């Protein structure tokens, strides 16, 4: 079978806390003796439209930040700002702090989101960083500070923290250094993204997964050159496929005996002809939020 | 709308591995009991048609290797309940959540924590199909992985994984060891009944579309429940039960559209098709979001 699968979220759940300043409440990430959260928690209504964050932050005291881990209040003993994230230093270390690191992911890469409200985890799902640096998340009011992550062995690699929804309903945020993905800004304004494109190497991975699970109606007898495929792919607002992408698809190619450029010829036919009512792995649309690695691990 | 799983940490803290000879699967460690599929006691060649009672009579506590990670939990008692093994262990799980064992209905959804050798690998959302299979993602060694829902702080355990069918869907039991559907834990070819579309969930999905301002498909007609069920079966949709009508209640109230009026709108979509339009960015009607799922993501 094949499902959109998230990493188990327990190691991240034990880091989540609630952070309040004024009448604003969102989530923080508690690692060792530091809590990370979106800086716009210091903003009032009158601040949110053009917040001069350095100016607003210097006027705040440690005691203006109310941090709660379940029943317990954590005492803030210092605060600083790193780009769009606030670092609240606390007098107590999180014992549940896992082995972790902070990474900035590339567009087309995937990661799990642990959506939280008032510091309590509510759900977990899988996302990709879109080529236009938005994410198609499920985030309501109160979800800021929810984080996205990958787990390699015993290590949690944090790659996203949530800050906002765009008018189109997609979402935008930062890495754990507080740098936004994309051309967005932590002010209360309607912001449009650049035109999105489809993550081709991931569509190809998913087609291979469909074959591994017995679905093959979209295959064809034809091949294509890499450049002629890319010409068609760009026409349809699909990302170009690089030779590194081709190399990454090798394992999936070997396992199934379908040359990458044969699968590209299939995808080209799907783009030109559409799906003619049919479905692949349940979907009526071509899915682009599985990486080759995602498909490999899940299918062995 | 995403498929969203429950946070899995409370269940991760309960996963262990259980080994008999070379056969290793997963178990669920709550208080001082470990729950797992009984077929752990079967050699690969025993699985063709096992005599579970006779295989268990030859077993002693000291034939069972239970491990949390690499740490052995000594087994101090054992009993078979339907198709699961209960192994009493000498340590109460310090991470035991508040929990319940529940038997769910077809159509209901739940999160699966896929595990191998006692270690969680992934979590995803499943629906229990009307033919009592699930469209899971499971490899060798996944048995004893569990499906669950979390209400407030209480984990309601509803599924334990035992097997894959010829069509590549999956079958298992509740935590009392009773299979969902007409399957047995024997390495024999078995067939699921023909599957049907989960009508209550499709209706939930239509409510979700209305809540988001997508309401072209609403019409001025209504229907009886019986007339709707008889029409729906002709399109291989499940009949609605009284419980289905009940769990659509909150979405009915939220939108002010009576359940039976939404049924009349769906009947017209069945009878006339989408005429080329979409609902919620899709020509397909989705059937694996329950009314609870719709609430979790809209409000
Ligand atoms: C933090 O919890 C919250 C998360 C948001 C809330 C809705 N969904 C989410 O993911 N973040 C915020 O509220 C942002 C705070 C800023 C960065 C100071 N703002 C935000 O997400 O605004 C969302 C709304 C939805 C529609 C839209 O365009 N905007 C932007 C603000 C706005 C401008 C003009 C008109 C209406 C809204
Ligand atoms: C337990 O980890 C394992 C999980 C399986 C492994 C592959 N995917 C899964 O979900 N369960 C088992 O191996 C089952 C043990 C029995 C119930 C004692 N058996 C099982 O899953 O058999 C699967 C195979 C795949 C093809 C097929 O038809 N079957 C069923 C039995 C069978 C019939 C005919 C020919 C070969 C096997």
Curated annotation (Swiss-Prot), chain A:
Changing residue 131 to H: In strain: Omicron/BA.1, Omicron/BA.2, Omicron/BA.2.12.1, Omicron/BA.2.75, Omicron/BA.4, Omicron/BA.5, Omicron/BQ.1.1, Omicron/XBB.1.5, Omicron/EG.5.1. Changing residue 188 to A: Does not affect ability to cleave and inactivate human TRMT1. Residues 1-300 form the Peptidase C30 domain. It catalyses: TSAVLQ-|-SGFRK-NH2 and SGVTFQ-|-GKFKK the two peptides corresponding to the two self-cleavage sites of the SARS 3C-like proteinase are the two most reactive peptide substrates. The enzyme exhibits a strong preference for substrates containing Gln at P1 position and Leu at P2 position. It is found in: Host cytoplasm; Host Golgi apparatus; Host nucleus. It comes from the Viruses. The active site is at 40 (for 3cl-pro activity), 144 (nucleophile). There is a cross-link at residues 4, 89 (Glycyl lysine isopeptide (Lys-Gly) (interchain with G-Cter in ubiquitin)). Residues 1-300 are cytoplasmic. Changing residue 144 to A: Complete loss of 3C-like proteinase nsp5 cleavage. Inhibited by pyridone-containing alpha-ketoamides compounds 13a and 13b. In turn, alpha-ketoamide 13b (tert-butyl (1-((S)-1-(((S)-4-(benzylamino)-3,4-dioxo-1-((S)-2-oxopyrrolidin-3-yl)butan-2-yl)amino)-3-cyclopropyl-1-oxopropan-2-yl)-2-oxo-1,2-dihydropyridin-3-yl)carbamate) inhibits SARS-CoV-2 replication in human lung cells. Inhibited ex vivo by michael acceptor inhibitor N3. Inhibited ex vivo by compound 11a and 11b. Changing residue 48 to A: Does not affect ability to cleave and inactivate human TRMT1. 3CL-PRO exists as monomer and homodimer. Only the homodimer shows catalytic activity. Interacts with host FBXO22; this interaction promotes the proteasomal degradation of nsp5. Cleaves the C-terminus of replicase polyprotein at 11 sites. Recognizes substrates containing the core sequence [ILMVF]-Q-|-[SGACN]. Cleaves and inactivates human TRMT1, preventing tRNA guanine(26)-dimethylation of tRNAs. May cleave human NLRP1 in lung epithelial cells, thereby activating the NLRP1 inflammasome pathway. May cleave human GSDMD, triggering alternative GSDME-mediated epithelial cell death upon activation of the NLRP1 inflammasome, which may enhance the release interleukins 1B, 6, 16 and 18. Also able to bind an ADP-ribose-1''-phosphate (ADRP). This is 3C-like proteinase nsp5. It comes from Severe acute respiratory syndrome coronavirus 2. The chain holds residues 3265 to 3564 of 7096 of the full protein.
From Swiss-Prot, chain B:
Inhibited by pyridone-containing alpha-ketoamides compounds 13a and 13b. In turn, alpha-ketoamide 13b (tert-butyl (1-((S)-1-(((S)-4-(benzylamino)-3,4-dioxo-1-((S)-2-oxopyrrolidin-3-yl)butan-2-yl)amino)-3-cyclopropyl-1-oxopropan-2-yl)-2-oxo-1,2-dihydropyridin-3-yl)carbamate) inhibits SARS-CoV-2 replication in human lung cells. Inhibited ex vivo by michael acceptor inhibitor N3. Inhibited ex vivo by compound 11a and 11b. Residues 1-299 form the Peptidase C30 domain. Residues 1-299 are cytoplasmic. It is found in: Host cytoplasm; Host Golgi apparatus; Host nucleus. It comes from the Viruses. There is a cross-link at residues 3, 88 (Glycyl lysine isopeptide (Lys-Gly) (interchain with G-Cter in ubiquitin)). The active site is at residues 39, 143. Cleaves the C-terminus of replicase polyprotein at 11 sites. Recognizes substrates containing the core sequence [ILMVF]-Q-|-[SGACN]. Cleaves and inactivates human TRMT1, preventing tRNA guanine(26)-dimethylation of tRNAs. May cleave human NLRP1 in lung epithelial cells, thereby activating the NLRP1 inflammasome pathway. May cleave human GSDMD, triggering alternative GSDME-mediated epithelial cell death upon activation of the NLRP1 inflammasome, which may enhance the release interleukins 1B, 6, 16 and 18. Also able to bind an ADP-ribose-1''-phosphate (ADRP). 3CL-PRO exists as monomer and homodimer. Only the homodimer shows catalytic activity. Interacts with host FBXO22; this interaction promotes the proteasomal degradation of nsp5. This is 3C-like proteinase nsp5.
């Amino acid at each position: 079978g094949f499902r959109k699968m998230a990493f188990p979220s327990g190691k991240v759940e034990g880091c989540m806390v609630q952070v309040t300043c004024g009448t604003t409440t969102l989530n923080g990430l508690w690692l060792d003796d530091v809590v990370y959260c979106p800086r716009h928690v210091i903003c009032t209504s009158e601040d949110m439209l053009n917040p001069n964050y350095e100016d607003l932050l210097i006027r705040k005291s440690n005691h203006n930040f109310l941090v709660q881990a379940g029943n317990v209040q954590l005492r803030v003993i210092g605060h600083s700002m790193q780009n769009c994230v606030l670092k609240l230093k606390v007098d107590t270390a999180n014992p549940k702090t896992p082995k972790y690191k902070f990474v900035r992911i590339q567009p087309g890469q995937t990661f799990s989101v642990l959506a939280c409200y008032n510091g309590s985890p509510s759900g977990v799902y899988q996302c990709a960083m879109r080529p236009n640096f938005t994410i198609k998340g499920s985030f309501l009011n109160g979800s800021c500070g929810s984080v996205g992550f990958n787990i390699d062995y015993d290590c949690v690699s944090f790659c996203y923290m949530h800050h906002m929804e765009l008018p189109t309903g997609v979402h935008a945020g930062t890495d754990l250094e507080g740098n936004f993905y994309g051309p967005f800004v932590d002010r209360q304004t309607a912001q449009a993204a650049g035109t999105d494109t489809t993550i081709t190497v991931n569509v190809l991975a998913w087609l291979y997964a469909a074959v591994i699970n017995g679905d093959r109606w979209f295959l064809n007898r034809f091949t294509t050159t890499l450049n002629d495929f890319n010409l068609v792919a760009m026409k349809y607002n699909y990302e170009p496929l690089t030779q590194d992408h081709v190399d990454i698809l090798g394992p999936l190619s070997a396992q199934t005996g379908i040359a990458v450029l044969d699968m590209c010829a299939s995808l080209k036919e799907l783009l030109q002809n559409g799906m003619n009512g049919r479905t692949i792995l349940g979907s009526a649309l071509l899915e682009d939020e599985f990486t080759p690695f995602d498909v490999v691990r899940q299918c062995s």
